[PDB]
Amino acid sequence: VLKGLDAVRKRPGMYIGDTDDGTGLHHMVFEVVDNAIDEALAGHCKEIIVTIHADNSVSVQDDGRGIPTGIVSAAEVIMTVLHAGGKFSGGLHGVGVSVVNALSQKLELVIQHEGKIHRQIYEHGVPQAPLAVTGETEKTGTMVRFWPSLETFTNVTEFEYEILAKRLRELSFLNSGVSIRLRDKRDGKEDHFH
Ligand SMILES: CO[C@@H]1[C@@H](OC(N)=O)[C@@H](O)[C@H](Oc2ccc3c(O)c(NC(=O)c4ccc(O)c(CC=C(C)C)c4)c(=O)oc3c2C)OC1(C)C
Numbered sequence: 001v002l003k004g005l006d007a008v009r010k011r012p013g014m015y016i017g018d019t020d021d022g023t024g025l026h027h028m029v030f031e032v033v034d035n036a037i038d039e040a041l042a043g044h045c046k047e048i049i050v051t052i053h054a055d056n057s058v059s060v061q062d063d064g065r066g067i068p069t070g071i072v073s074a075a076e077v078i079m080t081v082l083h084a085g086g087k088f089s090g091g092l093h094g095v096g097v098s099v100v101n102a103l104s105q106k107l108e109l110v111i112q113h114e115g116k117i118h119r120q121i122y123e124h125g126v127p128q129a130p131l132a133v134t135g136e137t138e139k140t141g142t143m144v145r146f147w148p149s150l151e152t153f154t155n156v157t158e159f160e161y162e163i164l165a166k167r168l169r170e171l172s173f174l175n176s177g178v179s180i181r182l183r184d185k186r187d188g189k190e191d192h193f194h
Helices: 002-010 012-016 023-041 074-080 097-102 161-174
Strands: 047-053 057-062 104-113 116-123 132-136 141-148 179-184 189-193
Touching: 002 012, 002 097, 012 023, 023 047, 023 057, 023 097, 023 141, 023 161, 047 161, 074 097, 074 104, 074 116, 097 104, 097 141, 161 179, 161 189
Parallel strands: 047 179
Antiparallel strands: 047 057, 057 141, 104 116, 104 141, 116 132, 179 189
8 A cells, every 4th residue: 555655664774774874775776686686596587787877876677577567567566565465784685676666766667578668657656657668679678777765865875886796796606697787877887797
């Protein structure tokens, strides 16, 4: 529900981890990647691309199946409901992307599959309009890009390349075969963990 989100916004730290030391802020990046890494362990994703935007926004693009689009879409459901369809200083593990959505001033969702492109925009967890096809494609994959809420995150508010590179590096190693790339639009630094 709408309340479901209210609860998250009310006590973010309980779900995401500490909101003042940079922990929660970077964990917002990790949950999304973990979702992509799961699509890879499933056998459908081969490459993951993680980009830091100079507007202090982070995007994660994958070439997996694309969250099912058909009918509210199931994708909308994954983005707005707590442990959708199931059950559950670092906050929660596998908290779900709905929690990253709720704690985001803005989140943009882009999905490709079945020859189409679908997009939807949310604000503080709320869809600003329905999910719609915007064009045609031959590729498949999910792209999530979000802008953390400044009413939730204090003190350490800007993403830091070093923190992500250490973890993405660990993730590729522990998940042999998965290719993850990291790019810093702020300075042109890029990394490829294989
Ligand atoms: C964040 O969404 C994640 C996905 O994340 C990424 N990055 O792909 C991924 O981690 C995993 O993705 C799944 C997990 C299960 C199915 C899955 O069972 C599919 N097969 C279907 O036949 C199907 C077709 C229509 C439909 O409404 C549903 C149920 C919807 C679900 C499970 C989200 C499933 C499918 O097409 O894609 C799937 C996908 C893409 O689970 C989600 C949806 C929570």
